């Protein structure tokens, strides 16, 4: 049969503003900071497909039982694998640094195929109804839409501490692998890539962030929030080989910022969320999202 899960790439959203959109036209979903997954559940047997289009089934054994209540069905799902922090908010860093005791959940937000019917050409409104009929009172988690028009859904989403809202046009088709104007993503917090220039201990109580410039890293502040247990342990192994006596910053750090510090060669790129930039170039109310081993320091610029 000719729907090819093995040829499927996820649909992508366009950065925009949702506050002026109406629920009559747009479905407001919460934005889940996790790992994007396509899921084929063929009468209970689950296969997972990354956005890059590769089998990642073996990387999430906690999801092997995802379809335990769906053994009578053959479905393709779209959703986010999440790991919930102590607030029950999906945490990206707890996902990327997950262990065997780590609870991974799959939160489904689309249905692409159901018992021999491919649904790429079916309107979102109708796919969602089939998704609800499939998952009601099962262990398959389908987060509901946020109530209200756009500004209310966005506010509610902020109240929960979620990442933002994705508005999906109720009449829209599913376009694999395409970034479309029919999905609008709107994030609550700004986000900045940084280069790690040093660390303090309580261990690693915090990191010293910088933006590359002509004379070295321009100090962008200290991040300590959003980091716990498993990740810091890995941070210590990534930092160890980078030990250096020379500071990488373009001005010697103020004494308060340099207290108990070890400098590292400016190699690791991380990502943080922040409210605003101070007039002197520090990140306000920064919090850790995670490390970005795909990026290298020479691409970090003030965004």
Ligand X SMILES: Nc1ncnc2c1ncn2[C@@H]1O[C@H](COP(=O)(O)OP(=O)(O)OP(=O)(O)O)[C@@H](O)[C@H]1O
Residues that bind ligand X (CB under 6 A): 12-13, 29, 31-32, 36, 80, 109, 166, 185, 187
Least gap, CB of 78 to ligand X (angstroms): 7
Q: Which is nearer to ligand X, 5 or 189 (CB)?
A: 189
Q: Which is nearer to ligand X, 16 or 224 (CB)?
A: 16
Least gap, CB of 5 to ligand X (angstroms): 18
| Sheet with 35-42, side-by-side order of all strands | 45-49, 35-42, 74-82, 105-114, 117-118
- The 3-state DSSP class for residue 197 equals strand
**CA separation for the pair 95, 80 (Å, rounded):** 11
Least gap, CB of 2 to ligand X (angstroms): 25
Q: Which is nearer to ligand X, 120 or 261 (CB)?
A: 120
Q: Could you tell me the sign of the dihedral formed by the alpha carbons of 156, 160, 163, 169, in that order?
A: negative
Residues 108, 114, 115, 120, Cα dihedral to 10° = -140
Least gap, CB of 100 to ligand X (angstroms): 25
Q: Which is nearer to ligand X, 43 or 178 (CB)?
A: 178
Q: For residue 200, count other CB atoms closer than 10 A to its CB.
A: 18
Q: Which is nearer to ligand X, 90 or 266 (CB)?
A: 90
Q: Which is nearer to ligand X, 36 or 282 (CB)?
A: 36
Tokens of 296: 């290298």
Least gap, CB of 25 to ligand X (angstroms): 17
**CA separation for the pair 290, 29 (Å, rounded):** 24
Neighbour-count burial of 110, counting CB atoms closer than 10 A to its CB (0-12 exposed, 13-18 middle, 19+ buried): buried
Least gap, CB of 187 to ligand X (angstroms): 6
Tokens of 103: 């609870």
């Amino acid at each position: 049969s000719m729907f090819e899960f093995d040829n499927l790439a996820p649909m992508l959203a366009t950065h925009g503003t949702v506050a002026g959109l109406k629920a009559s036209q747009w479905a407001f979903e919460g934005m889940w900071d996790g790992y994007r997954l396509l899921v084929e559940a063929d009468h209970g047997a689950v296969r997972l497909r990354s956005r890059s289009g590769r089998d990642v089934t073996a990387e999430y054994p906690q999801l092997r039982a995802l379809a335990e209540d769906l053994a009578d069905h053959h479905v393709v799902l779209d959703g986010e694998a999440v790991v919930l922090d102590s607030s029950g908010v999906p945490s990206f860093s707890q996902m990327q640094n997950r262990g065997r005791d780590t609870r991974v959940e799959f939160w489904a937000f689309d249905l692409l195929y159901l018992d021999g019917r491919a649904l790429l050409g079916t309107r979102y409104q109708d796919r969602r109804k089939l998704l609800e009929t499939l998952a009601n009172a099962t262990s398959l988690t389908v987060p509901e839409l946020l109530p209200g028009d756009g500004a209310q859904a966005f506010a509610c989403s902020r109240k929960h501490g979620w990442e933002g809202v994705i508005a999906k046009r109720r009449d829209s088709r599913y376009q694999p692998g395409r970034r479309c104007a029919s999905w609008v993503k709107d994030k609550h917090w700004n986000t900045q890539e940084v280069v790690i220039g040093g660390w303090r201990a309580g261990g690693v109580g915090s990191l010293l962030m910088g933006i590359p410039g002509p004379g070295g890293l321009q100090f962008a502040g200290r991040v300590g929030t959003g980091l716990s247990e498993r990740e810091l342990a890995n941070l210590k192994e990534m930092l160890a080989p980078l030990h250096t006596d020379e500071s990488p910053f373009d001005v010697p750090l103020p004494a308060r910022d340099a207290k108990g510090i070890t400098y590292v060669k400016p190699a690791l790129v991380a990502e943080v969320r922040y409210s605003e930039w101070t007039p002197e170039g520090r990140l306000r109310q920064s919090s850790w999202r995670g490390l970005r081993p795909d990026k290298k320091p020479s691409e970090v610029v003030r965004e």
